[PDB]
Design a protein around this ligand. Structure first.
Ligand SMILES: *[C@H](O)[C@H](C[C@@H]1C=CNC1=O)NC(=O)[C@H](CC1CCCCC1)NC(=O)OCc1cccc(Cl)c1
Ligand SMILES: *[C@H](O)[C@H](C[C@@H]1C=CNC1=O)NC(=O)[C@H](CC1CCCCC1)NC(=O)OCc1cccc(Cl)c1
Ligand SMILES: [Mg+2]
Ligand SMILES: [Mg+2]
Lengths: 301, 301
């Protein structure tokens, strides 16, 4: 029993982390087979990064401008190319620790583990959700760019995020592994900011199910609501609307607890209106929305 | 910027996890060089575990009673022995992935990472603190025994916890790697329960410093208190007394923020008396006490 914020074991991704240095900039790369993936802004100069023309910057580079270090041994770059906002460096050595992997572009509301790295060396692991505004609330210092987010599915590593920058509110923005930014962000130092966020409703409900599985019951009631009347409450409190799709995703949790989704919605509606009144749920005094239904099932087997 | 619950990268410990099966029981072992460490209650039978005599149970075993699986390959046991509440199984193969390691017995208030495992296979990683009542608030299902907790210090793995059992309140109890239980607990299925807990004061203050470093300032004030008057407030709200030792440990955080420890104590005193009033600190609506000063420095560099 017990419910914790849980990340995937990170060993498979640790074996892929390298250091990439271009000029005066140093950050992290992902070394899979004979290619290293990293953010393209590594080729930027401190002056020409208010509005860089990356095609020009890259044409002016040669393979010997990129230094790749896997642990101690230097990796020789034999080719370079750019795909969207990620740079790809061909190296003459395939990574012997390359796991089975996939590149996946995730939907807002989904979670993943982040392996924060500095200078090619893993520093820590934590769990994150793609917020509806396509930022993540991460923990990233300078030098952390190129750290990756991932999920694991029976030793297949699904990479879904590479870190690029921090926004003015302290949240973070990045790309999928094919270099497409999540959200409307671009890789120039400009005035872009996070838009207004919303709470991930299907995740709060999943976490309420985790609470029930673990003995937290004070918030339950006999009431039940409809989908329509619930979604009116959600709008008022800045919650994402609840779709039938989400109701079905919450199916297994509903069966294990015997509490129907729309029964749990009536509990959530009451918590939104009255607050918690000095009580806690799974150790928290606010409603938690960074656990997906999958995360709850995986930990509450 | 940003502050997250962060575990150590777990790859070095993943390479040490094995499955140990004795009779009908299966749990996890730690494979370091040519020895496997696991809880001794693996040799217990469902009947004789209300009050087992482990010396007798072990004398009645032979090496062929223990099955050790590292991934797919079976490991042959060539010797067995017992040290306190841990069983030690000599195997004929040294673990080629043995990291640099130490066994450490930690003090209440200290944190570590847990690699939860089932059937020798890592499942997830999370952060935990040794509570003052020598339990941990973990996430553990059946089959998780033998999962280990650890800290890392420049590729030296310090193992400090091995998991043995769950208590009636859903919290967890275990040993150091030499098989001495934390707290007064014993490895028989009896009526032992967690004693009353207290809040880890030096950790709350460290987390308030993390808040300041990350821009959360609404709780600061111009007041300052003495150690004596603060400790009177701590007692009233079930907080551990604050020692001069702790004040000195909080030194670096005090300097980086410019806020003296006893200045931050006057903020904490006011939060204890008035609550948060609908405000949050680093995303939480209650005071967090499972970050040590070291954890804050490591993440707020
Ligand atoms: C890369 O390592 C670094 C990670 C940032 C630095 C602190 N937290 C992070 O997430 N990324 C940057 O410094 C980017 C580089 C820009 C280059 C040109 C294209 C757009 C990205 N800049 C950035 O994050 O600026 C905002 C910021 C906020 C706080 C502190 C710093 Cl150093 C920068
Ligand atoms: C070992 O894998 C298992 C881990 C427990 C099971 C659920 N959470 C955990 O942490 N440990 C046990 O089942 C122990 C075994 C006892 C054997 C004899 C000596 C003392 C330990 N028992 C135990 O935890 O009992 C309490 C309990 C509470 C909830 C659910 C279960 Cl299955 C057991
Ligand atoms: Mg209800
Ligand atoms: Mg003050």
């Amino acid at each position: 029993s017990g419910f914790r914020k849980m990340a995937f074991p990170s060993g498979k991704v640790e074996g892929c982390m390298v250091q990439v240095t271009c000029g005066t900039t140093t950050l992290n790369g992902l070394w899979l087979d004979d290619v290293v993936y990293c953010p393209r802004h590594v080729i930027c100069t401190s002056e020409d990064m208010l509005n860089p023309n990356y095609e020009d910057l890259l044409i002016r580079k040669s393979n010997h401008n990129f230094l790749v270090q896997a642990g101690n041994v230097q990796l020789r770059v034999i080719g370079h190319s750019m795909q969207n906002c990620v740079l790809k460096l061909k190296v003459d050595t395939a990574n012997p620790k390359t796991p089975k992997y996939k590149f996946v572009r995730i939907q807002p509301g989904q979670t993943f583990s982040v392996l924060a790295c500095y200078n090619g060396s893993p520093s820590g692991v934590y769990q994150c959700a793609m917020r509806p505004n396509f930022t993540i609330k991460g923990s990233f210092l300078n030098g952390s760019c190129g750290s990756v987010g991932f999920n694991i599915d029976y030793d297949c590593v699904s990479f879904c995020y590479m870190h690029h920058m921090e926004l003015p509110t302290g949240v973070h923005a990045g790309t999928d592994l094919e270099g497409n930014f999540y959200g409307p962000f671009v890789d120039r130092q400009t005035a872009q900011a996070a838009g207004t966020d919303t709470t991930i409703t299907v995740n709060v409900l999943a976490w309420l199910y985790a609470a029930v599985i673990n003995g937290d019951r004070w918030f339950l009631n006999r009431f039940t609501t409809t989908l329509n009347d619930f979604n009116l409450v959600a709008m008022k409190y800045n919650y994402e609307p609840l779709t039938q799709d989400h109701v079905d995703i919450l199916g297994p949790l509903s069966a294990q607890t015997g509490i129907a989704v729309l029964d749990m919605c009536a509990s959530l509606k009451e918590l939104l209106q009255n607050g918690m009144n000095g009580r806690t749920i799974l150790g928290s005094a606010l409603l938690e929305d960074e656990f997906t239904p999958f995360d709850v099932v995986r930990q509450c087997s």
